[PDB]
Amino acid sequence: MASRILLNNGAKMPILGLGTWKSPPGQVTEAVKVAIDVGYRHIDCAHVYQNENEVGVAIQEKLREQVVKREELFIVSKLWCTYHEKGLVKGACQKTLSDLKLDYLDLYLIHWPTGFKPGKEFFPLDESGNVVPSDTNILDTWAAMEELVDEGLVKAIGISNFNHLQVEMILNKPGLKYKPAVNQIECHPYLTQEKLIQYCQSKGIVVTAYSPLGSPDRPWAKPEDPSLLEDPRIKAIAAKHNKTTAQVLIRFPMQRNLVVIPKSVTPERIAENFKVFDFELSSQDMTTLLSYNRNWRVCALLSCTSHKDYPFHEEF
Ligand SMILES: NC(=O)c1ccc[n+]([C@@H]2O[C@H](COP(=O)([O-])OP(=O)(O)OC[C@H]3O[C@@H](n4cnc5c(N)ncnc54)[C@H](OP(=O)(O)O)[C@@H]3O)[C@@H](O)[C@H]2O)c1
């Protein structure tokens, strides 16, 4: 297991990164500092997480400390849905750059294919509680992303939560200048994603797996929901290999040629989670983990199920 995967922009991306969704602002600076100290070189961020300033304090401090060089870090952020308009993309990217203490991002993603009405509210509502769409489509937002590459603000651009028909729409865009480098999607043993992965990889698009542990701290968790970290079938594979269940859940996507971004703010788990380059799951282990699929999503964007570009009506 090599630590980096080659993207279709010619740059290399670390296959393990640290997630930051739900990381409290008073904990995430120390989480990112610890992560860099114990070997992480990739941090997954987003403006909608409301903690980029605090992530940036950690990055800046480790660059100033000369723990790492900027060229050795791979920092990812995402354009939120209320900024899909031509005239707002650059300022959204630049706010993220300012917050993160950076002069460029390694990768900038369209967070979801759905554009929303611009304004202060991240989920603007009509009176009856529906999210209010933007009329701007994925293709014009993609052209705005391409301009960020050509202005030096981002090294790579990509997409997130795009279904295969939406990836195809990008790839078939008239006058396409840069292909997406990455599609970041939910992926774990309960949502194994073979078709969408198979499609993206066949096109040279690297897939990043989010919520690889099943997001036990997701805000809408219900007790009756399945639990990867407690699944005795997965705990058995981990015991066989003398690893934790989380380490198996992180190694799994790595052996599918995916990038994976487990989140923690607990120092011991941050270190735990990185110690996944010294063991191999067998093919039988991999097939067995894949067999647990049940099409279960942490992130189903339920307020947006009538948006024209809602991604999860399509089989994949
Ligand atoms: N593109 C998108 O739309 C999108 C959507 C969802 C997620 N993401 C990205 O993917 C990242 C990861 O997904 P996620 O945050 O949903 O969830 P996750 O990484 O699947 O799970 C995070 C949870 O697992 C716990 N945990 C971490 N390591 C553990 C270990 N070794 N043992 C036991 N528990 C452990 C964490 O607790 P503590 O933190 O308390 O240690 C936290 O409660 C996000 O943070 C975000 O960066 C992107």
Numbering used by the authors: 0 to 315
Please, what does the article write about this entry?
The key step in this pathway is the reduction of glucose to sorbitol catalyzed by aldose reductase (hAR, AKR1B1), a member of the NAD(P)H-dependent aldo-keto reductase superfamily. The inhibition of hAR would therefore block the polyol pathway, counteracting significantly the unbalanced conditions caused by intracellular oxidative stress typical of diabetes. Here we employ synchrotron X-ray irradiation at that wavelength to report a modification of hAR which reproduces the behavior of the activated form generated under diabetic oxidative stress conditions. According to the results presented here, the activated form differs structurally from the native form by the replacement of the Cys298 residue by Ser298 and, to a lesser extent, by Ala298.
